[PDB]
Amino acid sequence: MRVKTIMTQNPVTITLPATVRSFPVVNKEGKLVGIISVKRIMLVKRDVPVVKENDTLKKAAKLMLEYDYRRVVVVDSKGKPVGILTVGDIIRRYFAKSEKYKGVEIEPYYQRYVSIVWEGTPLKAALKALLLSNSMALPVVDSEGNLVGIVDETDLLRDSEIVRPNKPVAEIMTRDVIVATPHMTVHEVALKMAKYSIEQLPVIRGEGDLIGLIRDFDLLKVLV
Ligand SMILES: C[S@@+](CC[C@H](N)C(=O)[O-])C[C@H]1O[C@@H](n2cnc3c(N)ncnc32)[C@H](O)[C@@H]1O
């Protein structure tokens, strides 16, 4: 599979000078000069991964892994943006739809190292851990290390005190955790990521014995 099949075509761009998730940045001629993210409130990053629409998904995946960046801008011969390809696109439009990955377990790809947090941890400390995690979410465990929940940035909005403060993360965590196992296929993991709109599934054994984490980013390694 090629980039052209999985990318989102004709991305909205922003031409400099100037005052979704991010917008490709171009000059007067329309050539790509960087990308700007909404979170990053020059603020434009120049060293962004780029590919052509006829390149393989493998090439785009390699670049994402190389720059530890979640998207690549697709340009034409003129170096002008004609599409955008994100990790999300690869998961939802490719891994979750292709028949090729129904026969590939995630055992060789999931992370054995995972940042977690005890459910009794005050929110601020839990947020510090989230900030220092390579995952968008922190699996939550009880006092004995058993998996009991999971939490991410969006869960902060579950705190009624935002209507305008350092309680246990247990108060905003998601209790029903969608999990994976080492033998689960890339196909099924992607199906779950797409279905629940989540970027990671804790990897377990037994009923709640945490042994790893499979992130959408980890699935890119399958393409290599
Ligand atoms: C639907 S995801 C979307 C996150 C996306 N980055 C966003 O900003 O919209 C956010 C929710 O999924 C939950 N979540 C994350 N991973 C999960 C998992 N493995 N199992 C169950 N729920 C999960 C989080 O706790 C949170 O309530």
Side-chain angles (χ1 to χ4, degrees), residues 136-137 150-152 154-155 158 173-174 176-179 196-202:
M136 295 185 71
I150 187 157
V151 64
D152 77 0
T154 74
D155 293 323
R158 286 170 174 171
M173 75 179 185
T174 295
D176 184 33
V177 193
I178 304 303
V179 304
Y196 300 107
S197 292
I198 52 186
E199 300 89 343
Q200 64 291 301
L201 285 65

PDB file of all heavy atoms in Angstrom, residues 136-137 150-152 154-155 158 173-174 176-179 196-202, ligand 1:
ATOM      1  N   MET A 136      -0.082   8.198  24.982  1.00  0.00           N
ATOM      2  CA  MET A 136      -1.097   9.206  25.228  1.00  0.00           C
ATOM      3  C   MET A 136      -1.901   8.870  26.478  1.00  0.00           C
ATOM      4  O   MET A 136      -2.643   9.711  26.982  1.00  0.00           O
ATOM      5  CB  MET A 136      -2.036   9.305  24.029  1.00  0.00           C
ATOM      6  CG  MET A 136      -1.353   9.795  22.770  1.00  0.00           C
ATOM      7  SD  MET A 136      -2.545  10.011  21.450  1.00  0.00           S
ATOM      8  CE  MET A 136      -3.416  11.440  22.040  1.00  0.00           C
ATOM      9  N   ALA A 137      -1.745   7.651  26.986  1.00  0.00           N
ATOM     10  CA  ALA A 137      -2.488   7.246  28.173  1.00  0.00           C
ATOM     11  C   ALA A 137      -1.661   6.478  29.185  1.00  0.00           C
ATOM     12  O   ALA A 137      -0.663   5.842  28.840  1.00  0.00           O
ATOM     13  CB  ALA A 137      -3.689   6.404  27.771  1.00  0.00           C
ATOM     14  N   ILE A 150      -7.571   3.216  33.148  1.00  0.00           N
ATOM     15  CA  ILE A 150      -6.662   3.870  32.223  1.00  0.00           C
ATOM     16  C   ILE A 150      -7.085   5.331  32.170  1.00  0.00           C
ATOM     17  O   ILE A 150      -8.256   5.643  32.374  1.00  0.00           O
ATOM     18  CB  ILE A 150      -6.731   3.179  30.833  1.00  0.00           C
ATOM     19  CG1 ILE A 150      -5.655   3.747  29.906  1.00  0.00           C
ATOM     20  CG2 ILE A 150      -8.136   3.306  30.245  1.00  0.00           C
ATOM     21  CD1 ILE A 150      -5.280   2.802  28.780  1.00  0.00           C
ATOM     22  N   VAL A 151      -6.141   6.230  31.920  1.00  0.00           N
ATOM     23  CA  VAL A 151      -6.470   7.651  31.885  1.00  0.00           C
ATOM     24  C   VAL A 151      -5.635   8.431  30.878  1.00  0.00           C
ATOM     25  O   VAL A 151      -4.462   8.121  30.669  1.00  0.00           O
ATOM     26  CB  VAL A 151      -6.277   8.286  33.295  1.00  0.00           C
ATOM     27  CG1 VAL A 151      -4.801   8.219  33.718  1.00  0.00           C
ATOM     28  CG2 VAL A 151      -6.761   9.725  33.295  1.00  0.00           C
ATOM     29  N   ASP A 152      -6.253   9.421  30.235  1.00  0.00           N
ATOM     30  CA  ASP A 152      -5.535  10.271  29.293  1.00  0.00           C
ATOM     31  C   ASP A 152      -5.948  11.724  29.476  1.00  0.00           C
ATOM     32  O   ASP A 152      -6.763  12.042  30.349  1.00  0.00           O
ATOM     33  CB  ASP A 152      -5.697   9.796  27.831  1.00  0.00           C
ATOM     34  CG  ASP A 152      -7.035  10.152  27.205  1.00  0.00           C
ATOM     35  OD1 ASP A 152      -7.892  10.781  27.856  1.00  0.00           O
ATOM     36  OD2 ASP A 152      -7.215   9.792  26.023  1.00  0.00           O
ATOM     37  N   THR A 154      -7.855  13.777  27.834  1.00  0.00           N
ATOM     38  CA  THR A 154      -9.274  14.092  27.698  1.00  0.00           C
ATOM     39  C   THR A 154     -10.085  13.799  28.957  1.00  0.00           C
ATOM     40  O   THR A 154     -11.148  14.391  29.168  1.00  0.00           O
ATOM     41  CB  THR A 154      -9.911  13.325  26.516  1.00  0.00           C
ATOM     42  OG1 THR A 154     -10.082  11.947  26.867  1.00  0.00           O
ATOM     43  CG2 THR A 154      -9.027  13.428  25.280  1.00  0.00           C
ATOM     44  N   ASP A 155      -9.591  12.898  29.802  1.00  0.00           N
ATOM     45  CA  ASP A 155     -10.307  12.557  31.025  1.00  0.00           C
ATOM     46  C   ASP A 155     -10.305  13.683  32.050  1.00  0.00           C
ATOM     47  O   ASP A 155     -11.097  13.679  32.989  1.00  0.00           O
ATOM     48  CB  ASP A 155      -9.732  11.279  31.640  1.00  0.00           C
ATOM     49  CG  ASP A 155      -9.982  10.067  30.773  1.00  0.00           C
ATOM     50  OD1 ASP A 155     -11.072   9.995  30.164  1.00  0.00           O
ATOM     51  OD2 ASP A 155      -9.105   9.182  30.702  1.00  0.00           O
ATOM     52  N   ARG A 158     -13.452  15.433  32.895  1.00  0.00           N
ATOM     53  CA  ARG A 158     -14.459  14.755  33.706  1.00  0.00           C
ATOM     54  C   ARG A 158     -14.489  15.368  35.099  1.00  0.00           C
ATOM     55  O   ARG A 158     -15.351  15.035  35.914  1.00  0.00           O
ATOM     56  CB  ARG A 158     -14.153  13.262  33.819  1.00  0.00           C
ATOM     57  CG  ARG A 158     -14.439  12.461  32.567  1.00  0.00           C
ATOM     58  CD  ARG A 158     -13.866  11.060  32.711  1.00  0.00           C
ATOM     59  NE  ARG A 158     -14.218  10.194  31.593  1.00  0.00           N
ATOM     60  CZ  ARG A 158     -13.701   8.984  31.409  1.00  0.00           C
ATOM     61  NH1 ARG A 158     -12.810   8.512  32.269  1.00  0.00           N
ATOM     62  NH2 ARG A 158     -14.079   8.245  30.373  1.00  0.00           N
ATOM     63  N   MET A 173     -10.593   8.353  36.014  1.00  0.00           N
ATOM     64  CA  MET A 173     -10.155   7.280  35.128  1.00  0.00           C
ATOM     65  C   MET A 173     -11.273   6.464  34.488  1.00  0.00           C
ATOM     66  O   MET A 173     -12.406   6.416  34.986  1.00  0.00           O
ATOM     67  CB  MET A 173      -9.220   6.333  35.885  1.00  0.00           C
ATOM     68  CG  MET A 173      -9.932   5.409  36.869  1.00  0.00           C
ATOM     69  SD  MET A 173      -8.768   4.317  37.697  1.00  0.00           S
ATOM     70  CE  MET A 173      -9.884   3.283  38.657  1.00  0.00           C
ATOM     71  N   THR A 174     -10.942   5.838  33.363  1.00  0.00           N
ATOM     72  CA  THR A 174     -11.865   4.967  32.647  1.00  0.00           C
ATOM     73  C   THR A 174     -11.639   3.581  33.258  1.00  0.00           C
ATOM     74  O   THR A 174     -10.519   3.063  33.238  1.00  0.00           O
ATOM     75  CB  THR A 174     -11.537   4.935  31.142  1.00  0.00           C
ATOM     76  OG1 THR A 174     -11.749   6.237  30.573  1.00  0.00           O
ATOM     77  CG2 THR A 174     -12.401   3.910  30.425  1.00  0.00           C
ATOM     78  N   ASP A 176     -13.339   0.542  32.443  1.00  0.00           N
ATOM     79  CA  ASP A 176     -13.420  -0.586  31.525  1.00  0.00           C
ATOM     80  C   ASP A 176     -12.319  -0.442  30.489  1.00  0.00           C
ATOM     81  O   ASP A 176     -12.467   0.274  29.501  1.00  0.00           O
ATOM     82  CB  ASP A 176     -14.787  -0.636  30.843  1.00  0.00           C
ATOM     83  CG  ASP A 176     -14.944  -1.856  29.957  1.00  0.00           C
ATOM     84  OD1 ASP A 176     -14.370  -2.910  30.298  1.00  0.00           O
ATOM     85  OD2 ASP A 176     -15.647  -1.768  28.931  1.00  0.00           O
ATOM     86  N   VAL A 177     -11.213  -1.136  30.726  1.00  0.00           N
ATOM     87  CA  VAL A 177     -10.060  -1.059  29.841  1.00  0.00           C
ATOM     88  C   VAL A 177     -10.102  -2.062  28.694  1.00  0.00           C
ATOM     89  O   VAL A 177     -10.348  -3.260  28.894  1.00  0.00           O
ATOM     90  CB  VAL A 177      -8.754  -1.269  30.642  1.00  0.00           C
ATOM     91  CG1 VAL A 177      -7.555  -0.872  29.802  1.00  0.00           C
ATOM     92  CG2 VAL A 177      -8.794  -0.451  31.926  1.00  0.00           C
ATOM     93  N   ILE A 178      -9.885  -1.550  27.485  1.00  0.00           N
ATOM     94  CA  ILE A 178      -9.851  -2.366  26.283  1.00  0.00           C
ATOM     95  C   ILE A 178      -8.413  -2.861  26.191  1.00  0.00           C
ATOM     96  O   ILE A 178      -7.488  -2.056  26.049  1.00  0.00           O
ATOM     97  CB  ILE A 178     -10.180  -1.531  25.038  1.00  0.00           C
ATOM     98  CG1 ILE A 178     -11.541  -0.852  25.219  1.00  0.00           C
ATOM     99  CG2 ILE A 178     -10.161  -2.421  23.805  1.00  0.00           C
ATOM    100  CD1 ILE A 178     -12.674  -1.819  25.502  1.00  0.00           C
ATOM    101  N   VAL A 179      -8.232  -4.175  26.271  1.00  0.00           N
ATOM    102  CA  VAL A 179      -6.896  -4.767  26.267  1.00  0.00           C
ATOM    103  C   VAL A 179      -6.532  -5.643  25.083  1.00  0.00           C
ATOM    104  O   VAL A 179      -7.381  -6.046  24.287  1.00  0.00           O
ATOM    105  CB  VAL A 179      -6.672  -5.625  27.548  1.00  0.00           C
ATOM    106  CG1 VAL A 179      -6.905  -4.795  28.788  1.00  0.00           C
ATOM    107  CG2 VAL A 179      -7.615  -6.822  27.552  1.00  0.00           C
ATOM    108  N   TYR A 196     -12.998   2.217  19.190  1.00  0.00           N
ATOM    109  CA  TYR A 196     -13.058   2.998  20.418  1.00  0.00           C
ATOM    110  C   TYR A 196     -12.333   4.341  20.342  1.00  0.00           C
ATOM    111  O   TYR A 196     -12.344   5.110  21.308  1.00  0.00           O
ATOM    112  CB  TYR A 196     -12.486   2.167  21.568  1.00  0.00           C
ATOM    113  CG  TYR A 196     -13.232   0.872  21.801  1.00  0.00           C
ATOM    114  CD1 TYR A 196     -12.669  -0.355  21.451  1.00  0.00           C
ATOM    115  CD2 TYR A 196     -14.512   0.875  22.355  1.00  0.00           C
ATOM    116  CE1 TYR A 196     -13.357  -1.549  21.646  1.00  0.00           C
ATOM    117  CE2 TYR A 196     -15.212  -0.314  22.558  1.00  0.00           C
ATOM    118  CZ  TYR A 196     -14.629  -1.521  22.200  1.00  0.00           C
ATOM    119  OH  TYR A 196     -15.313  -2.699  22.395  1.00  0.00           O
ATOM    120  N   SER A 197     -11.718   4.621  19.196  1.00  0.00           N
ATOM    121  CA  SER A 197     -10.976   5.861  18.991  1.00  0.00           C
ATOM    122  C   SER A 197      -9.908   6.037  20.061  1.00  0.00           C
ATOM    123  O   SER A 197      -9.807   7.089  20.689  1.00  0.00           O
ATOM    124  CB  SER A 197     -11.918   7.065  18.997  1.00  0.00           C
ATOM    125  OG  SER A 197     -12.762   7.050  17.853  1.00  0.00           O
ATOM    126  N   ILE A 198      -9.122   4.989  20.266  1.00  0.00           N
ATOM    127  CA  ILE A 198      -8.052   5.018  21.256  1.00  0.00           C
ATOM    128  C   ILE A 198      -6.730   4.710  20.563  1.00  0.00           C
ATOM    129  O   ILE A 198      -6.684   3.942  19.599  1.00  0.00           O
ATOM    130  CB  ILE A 198      -8.313   4.000  22.384  1.00  0.00           C
ATOM    131  CG1 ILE A 198      -8.592   2.620  21.783  1.00  0.00           C
ATOM    132  CG2 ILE A 198      -9.485   4.480  23.248  1.00  0.00           C
ATOM    133  CD1 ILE A 198      -8.994   1.565  22.806  1.00  0.00           C
ATOM    134  N   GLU A 199      -5.655   5.312  21.064  1.00  0.00           N
ATOM    135  CA  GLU A 199      -4.335   5.142  20.469  1.00  0.00           C
ATOM    136  C   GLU A 199      -3.464   4.062  21.101  1.00  0.00           C
ATOM    137  O   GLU A 199      -2.334   3.849  20.662  1.00  0.00           O
ATOM    138  CB  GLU A 199      -3.581   6.475  20.504  1.00  0.00           C
ATOM    139  CG  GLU A 199      -4.270   7.606  19.735  1.00  0.00           C
ATOM    140  CD  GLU A 199      -5.255   8.410  20.574  1.00  0.00           C
ATOM    141  OE1 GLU A 199      -5.673   7.945  21.658  1.00  0.00           O
ATOM    142  OE2 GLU A 199      -5.625   9.518  20.131  1.00  0.00           O
ATOM    143  N   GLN A 200      -3.977   3.379  22.120  1.00  0.00           N
ATOM    144  CA  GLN A 200      -3.186   2.347  22.780  1.00  0.00           C
ATOM    145  C   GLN A 200      -4.010   1.361  23.591  1.00  0.00           C
ATOM    146  O   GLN A 200      -5.037   1.721  24.169  1.00  0.00           O
ATOM    147  CB  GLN A 200      -2.159   2.987  23.715  1.00  0.00           C
ATOM    148  CG  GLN A 200      -2.778   3.760  24.882  1.00  0.00           C
ATOM    149  CD  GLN A 200      -3.479   5.027  24.441  1.00  0.00           C
ATOM    150  OE1 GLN A 200      -2.866   5.908  23.837  1.00  0.00           O
ATOM    151  NE2 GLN A 200      -4.771   5.134  24.753  1.00  0.00           N
ATOM    152  N   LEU A 201      -3.543   0.116  23.634  1.00  0.00           N
ATOM    153  CA  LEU A 201      -4.198  -0.932  24.409  1.00  0.00           C
ATOM    154  C   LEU A 201      -3.195  -1.598  25.329  1.00  0.00           C
ATOM    155  O   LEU A 201      -2.134  -2.033  24.885  1.00  0.00           O
ATOM    156  CB  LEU A 201      -4.786  -2.031  23.516  1.00  0.00           C
ATOM    157  CG  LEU A 201      -6.071  -1.813  22.714  1.00  0.00           C
ATOM    158  CD1 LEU A 201      -5.862  -0.742  21.669  1.00  0.00           C
ATOM    159  CD2 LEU A 201      -6.479  -3.129  22.061  1.00  0.00           C
ATOM    160  N   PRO A 202      -3.494  -1.651  26.632  1.00  0.00           N
ATOM    161  CA  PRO A 202      -2.550  -2.314  27.532  1.00  0.00           C
ATOM    162  C   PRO A 202      -2.460  -3.777  27.086  1.00  0.00           C
ATOM    163  O   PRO A 202      -3.452  -4.355  26.640  1.00  0.00           O
ATOM    164  CB  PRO A 202      -3.230  -2.187  28.887  1.00  0.00           C
ATOM    165  CG  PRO A 202      -3.909  -0.855  28.794  1.00  0.00           C
ATOM    166  CD  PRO A 202      -4.492  -0.872  27.389  1.00  0.00           C
TER     167      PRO A 202
HETATM  168  C1  LIG B   1     -11.819   8.029  22.925  1.00  0.00           C
HETATM  169  S1  LIG B   1     -10.086   8.346  23.401  1.00  0.00           S
HETATM  170  C2  LIG B   1      -9.730   9.723  22.269  1.00  0.00           C
HETATM  171  C3  LIG B   1      -8.373  10.346  22.607  1.00  0.00           C
HETATM  172  C4  LIG B   1      -7.967  11.339  21.510  1.00  0.00           C
HETATM  173  N1  LIG B   1      -6.517  11.571  21.586  1.00  0.00           N
HETATM  174  C5  LIG B   1      -8.707  12.653  21.685  1.00  0.00           C
HETATM  175  O1  LIG B   1      -8.126  13.632  22.117  1.00  0.00           O
HETATM  176  O2  LIG B   1      -9.890  12.733  21.394  1.00  0.00           O
HETATM  177  C6  LIG B   1     -10.185   9.095  25.043  1.00  0.00           C
HETATM  178  C7  LIG B   1     -10.886   8.126  25.997  1.00  0.00           C
HETATM  179  O3  LIG B   1     -10.455   6.770  25.723  1.00  0.00           O
HETATM  180  C8  LIG B   1     -10.074   6.164  26.968  1.00  0.00           C
HETATM  181  N2  LIG B   1      -9.082   5.117  26.713  1.00  0.00           N
HETATM  182  C9  LIG B   1      -7.797   5.248  26.239  1.00  0.00           C
HETATM  183  N3  LIG B   1      -7.287   4.062  26.028  1.00  0.00           N
HETATM  184  C10 LIG B   1      -8.161   3.121  26.475  1.00  0.00           C
HETATM  185  C11 LIG B   1      -8.159   1.704  26.606  1.00  0.00           C
HETATM  186  N4  LIG B   1      -7.055   0.959  26.244  1.00  0.00           N
HETATM  187  N5  LIG B   1      -9.258   1.091  27.094  1.00  0.00           N
HETATM  188  C12 LIG B   1     -10.325   1.782  27.510  1.00  0.00           C
HETATM  189  N6  LIG B   1     -10.385   3.105  27.377  1.00  0.00           N
HETATM  190  C13 LIG B   1      -9.327   3.804  26.900  1.00  0.00           C
HETATM  191  C14 LIG B   1      -9.531   7.327  27.811  1.00  0.00           C
HETATM  192  O4  LIG B   1      -9.497   7.061  29.217  1.00  0.00           O
HETATM  193  C15 LIG B   1     -10.545   8.425  27.463  1.00  0.00           C
HETATM  194  O5  LIG B   1     -11.738   8.333  28.259  1.00  0.00           O
END
